[model samples]
Target: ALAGTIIAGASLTFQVLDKVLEELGKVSRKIAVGIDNESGGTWTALNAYFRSGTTDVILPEFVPNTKALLYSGRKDTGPVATGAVAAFAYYMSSGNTLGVMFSVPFDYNWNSNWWDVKIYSGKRRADQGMYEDLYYGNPYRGDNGWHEKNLGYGLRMKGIMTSAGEAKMQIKISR
Candidate 1:
């Protein structure tokens, strides 16, 4: 009966992971909406694209040119394994990119979700390459906690993820 027990255990684990991802899905949806509000309704491209579930990597050019270039999105479902929704956000200021990302991997166990916040000089575009770089090149990657950094040029960034793997990242840049 050992094989039978193993099968049941695996099924249970799958169910729990599905539930965790369901919560994460909700968190991602809210982040998309929050981005629209942050741009003061001047930008809705991300919000529109998210609802359609398109896998396009290049964001639209209708981004607001007022000051802050805000960005938020999750990795396309087609590329990543299921239940591992990697999410990120950023704000640019004075040719610098302030960014944060949180990733829930397929084997994500309790408090094992990898996350990081980073600052880089030079404006960066929101694309797949940048996402991969942020996910892999982070130096202070952690599991669950809050990170805040004061980037020069009156910019501040904060990123946090719950132990359950829900992420919330934002940045404020003043000109």
Candidate 2:
């Protein structure tokens, strides 16, 4: 009976995570995550985090293999095509969240063009605060093909800016 209940719980979480991916994909044309099978649960936690603007909420516990939480939108004024940004977050085994972000500045002079990756301990939701932190958090300039970082706990991130004039990017996290 206990095992049956646990299995059912896992199924529900997978559905929620898949739902998140479906909604995220609708926000932009170029956002994509190559996950063969979706697992874990982050939708409810993210909703609470963003609604209350607090990172104290309880996030999904584990991401069995690999899961990607993504965002793609405009950087400043104009549509997503004029000045675009792509951001992604991954749930780490250490109960922390790792975020990777980059943008195609276009005519947005405030930031020029930049890329950055950060770790939010415990939990976090992509908001103005999180965006500012990544933007002003010692960003790297230029259309770098790939930026790599070795996060502690056997985790590493490799990301790249896909274009010089479009808000398209990719990130791969491995343990």
For candidate 1, write residues 6-63 as lDDT tens digits.
1111122323333433444443331221111132223222211222222223333333
Weakest ten-residue segment in model 1 by summed lDDT: 1-10
Which residue window of length 10 is worst by lDDT in model 2? 1-10
Tell me the lDDT of model 1 at 62.
39
lDDT of model 1, residue 115: 47
lDDT of 2 by residue, 26-108 (tens): 33222222221122333221321221111111233223443443233333323334444544455554567665555555454
Candidate 2 error regions (>4 Å): 1-82, 86-88, 108-111
For every model shown, what is its TM-score relative to the native structure? 0.44, 0.50
CA deviation > 4 Å runs, candidate 1 = 1-81, 86-93, 108-111, 126-129, 139-144, 170-175
Show how many residue pairs clash in every candidate, following the order shown. Answer: 0, 0
- Candidate 1: what lDDT? 0.37
